[PDB]
């Protein structure tokens, strides 16, 4: 019956079944899902199976200065039109099948390490094109609710940085994963740290700190050493602009504790100029590649002390057994000093 027919919107809303107890709690999963298709997309008003040529609707109204008359395509000429529409339909399907594949993260199914692009431009014509965003953790958090039972939300941790010392991180929370991505990355650029870098490639000194239960030990390294660090530290270091560093993470490997523990340690590093000013002495760098040449890296801006720094015959500094065990060669590990891709 003609009167029992419905519109396409009604038919797709029913067929897709996006509203319902199945879609309320995700009670239904969709390895095979009905996908909405616009069936009026490639359709031309006036074109039908019979192949009639209606002047002014599907063919031009005037031809050679005269009004065209009703005509019908030949059986052969109409098959070509039908065949051409089928090919155009598979070509359109091929255009949708051709989607550019994006680079993966730390692993194929992991969100960690994936770039989210620059943060969105602020309301007052503010822009962050110089900043890159990286995901550090995407978690599904499940909240038990008084009336609705277990609900699913997303907690995301992302880090931002411009590669020139300015970097930050923020947590994002939302019911949708892409709304959380927006919140974290936009928020992160308003909580930026500035990180001091020695010669714009490494840290100024070895950093050993604990944040809660996560211990991070970082070592200053020369050029060409690369980033031999926990994968998250590698990601964060590329955003900061650190090229050469060793880091060892022990204790609880909690991504959030690691991130904020890392930023706390990198933000409290004393530069060579700060050391020179504090002690009113020259900071002299001795490099084995340059032999005995003394390279003054920093000099105090104020007066220069005349009394040498006391030379304690033996320093009362606390040592790391891992560092000492290595220096002596007693540290044997099949996993240390393994060949890895450039980082």
């Amino acid at each position: 019956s003609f009167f029992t027919k419905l519109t396409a919107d009604e038919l797709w809303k029913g067929a897709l079944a996006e509203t319902g107890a199945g879609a309320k709690k995700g009670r239904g999963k969709r390895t095979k899902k009905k996908k909405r298709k616009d069936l009026n997309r490639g359709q031309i008003i006036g074109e039908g199976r019979y192949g009639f040529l209606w002047p002014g609707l599907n063919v031009p109204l005037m031809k050679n200065g005269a009004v065209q008359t009703i005509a019908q395509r030949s059986k052969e000429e109409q098959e070509k039109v039908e065949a051409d529409m089928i090919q155009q339909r598979e070509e359109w399907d091929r255009k949708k099948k051709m989607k550019v594949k994006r680079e993966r993260g730390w692993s194929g199914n992991s969100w960690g390490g994936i770039s989210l692009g620059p943060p969105d431009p602020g309301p007052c014509g503010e822009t962050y094109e110089d900043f890159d965003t990286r995901i550090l953790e995407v978690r599904n958090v499940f909240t038990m609710t008084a009336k609705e039972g277990r609900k699913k939300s997303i907690r995301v941790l992302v880090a931002v940085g411009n590669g020139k010392g300015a970097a930050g991180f923020s947590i994002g929370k939302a019911t949708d994963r892409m709304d959380a991505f927006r919140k974290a990355k936009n928020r992160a650029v308003h909580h930026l740290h500035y990180i001091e870098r020695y010669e714009d490639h490494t840290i100024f000194h070895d950093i050993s700190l604990r944040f809660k239960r996560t211990h991070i030990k970082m070592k200053k390294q020369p050029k060409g050493y690369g980033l031999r660090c926990h994968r998250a530290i590698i990601t964060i270091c590329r955003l900061i602009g650190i090229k050469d560093m060793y880091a060892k993470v022990s204790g609880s490997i909690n991504m959030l504790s690691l991130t904020q523990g890392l930023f706390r340690g990198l933000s409290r590093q004393e530069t060579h100029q700060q050391l020179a000013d504090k002690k009113g002495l020259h900071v002299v760098e001795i490099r084995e590649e340059c032999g005995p040449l003394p390279i003054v890296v920093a000099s105090p801006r104020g007066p220069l002390r005349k009394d040498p720094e006391p030379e304690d015959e033996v320093p009362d500094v606390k040592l790391d057994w891992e560092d000492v065990k290595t220096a002596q060669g007693m540290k044997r590990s099949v996993w240390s000093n393994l060949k890895r891709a450039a980082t």
Binding site: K99, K101, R102, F142
Partner: protein, 184 residues
């Protein structure tokens, strides 16, 4: 502090229990657990203050001779009146005399509470006889008057392990003027 918590952040805030504050208070505000404690403690002070006034001879020689005992004292949280339950004696006639003396004394008692300025802002004091013996007083009064007449296993997956393809769809594919009159 003790197992009973006393770390209130607004600990120094000046407790102001007045009838006017209730009208400017936010009924939307939900009372804290320790907000009751401030009310409960004030009620204890009102009990001690009335109880002590009761046993001193000078305040009112009529009041002292009665040897009145207060069962309980609970100030209204509205602050309209200070309820002051007084234990009811078994003697039926004595419950009226005690009550009458209390009502007359109550008016002067409120002024005497201003003498202790800390308790100055006291609402009108109300005395309530304990119905345990008082309710029976009303009945027995009617009981004698009354005329009694001429006597004679589907597997349930873990929600945290539930697989999702949101990343696989993300990683698989990057998702996909001039106006003029009489145009020819």
């Amino acid at each position: 502090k003790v197992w009973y918590e006393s770390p209130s952040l607004g600990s120094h805030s000046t407790y102001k229990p007045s009838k006017l504050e209730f009208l400017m208070r936010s009924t939307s505000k939900k009372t804290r657990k320790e907000d009751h404690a401030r009310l409960r403690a004030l009620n204890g002070l009102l009990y001690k203050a009335l109880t002590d006034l009761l046993c001193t001879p000078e305040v009112s020689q009529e009041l002292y001779d009665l040897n009145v005992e207060l069962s309980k004292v609970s100030l209204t949280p509205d602050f309209s009146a200070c309820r002051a339950y007084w234990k009811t004696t078994l003697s039926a006639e004595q419950n009226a005399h005690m009550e009458a003396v209390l009502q007359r004394s109550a008016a002067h008692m409120r002024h005497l509470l201003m003498s202790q300025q800390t308790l100055r802002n006291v609402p009108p004091i109300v005395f309530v006889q304990d119905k345990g013996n008082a309710a029976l007083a009303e009945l027995d009064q009617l009981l004698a008057v009354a005329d009694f007449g001429p006597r004679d296993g589907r597997k349930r997956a873990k929600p945290r392990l539930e697989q999702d393809s949101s990343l696989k769809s993300y990683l698989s594919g990057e998702e996909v003027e001039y106006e003029c009159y009489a145009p020819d």
